Amino acid sequence: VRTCLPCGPGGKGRCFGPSICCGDELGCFVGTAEALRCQEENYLPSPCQSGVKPCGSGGRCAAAGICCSPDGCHEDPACDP
């Protein structure tokens, strides 16, 4: 499954939702300017997925100790380095 659009500082992050941009060395931007770019993903035909490890309920580790779904992010030890 294709990875979602890249985003944020130095394009070092990937989109996890229409308005969620994360990276292991960035943390997560939720609804900030850095994640505006992620709104483009929804006008793209194919499905995308960011992150590798499944966590929480339908989410994916997006950053150090952080688990995100396209709807939000929460703290999750399972996502620690």
Ligand X SMILES: N[C@@H](Cc1ccccc1)C(=O)N[C@@H](Cc1ccc(O)cc1)C(=O)O
Which amino acid, 30? V
Q: Which helix (H) or strand (E) holds 51?
A: none
**Options 5, 15, 35, 38; binder of a copy of itself; rule CB under 8 A:** 35
E strands along 26-71, which residues? 27-30, 54-55, 59-63, 66-69
Nearer to a copy of itself among residue 31 and residue 48 (C-beta):
31
32 binds ligand X (CB under 6 A): no
65 binds a copy of itself (CB under 8 A): yes
Nearer to a copy of itself among residue 5 and residue 23 (C-beta):
23
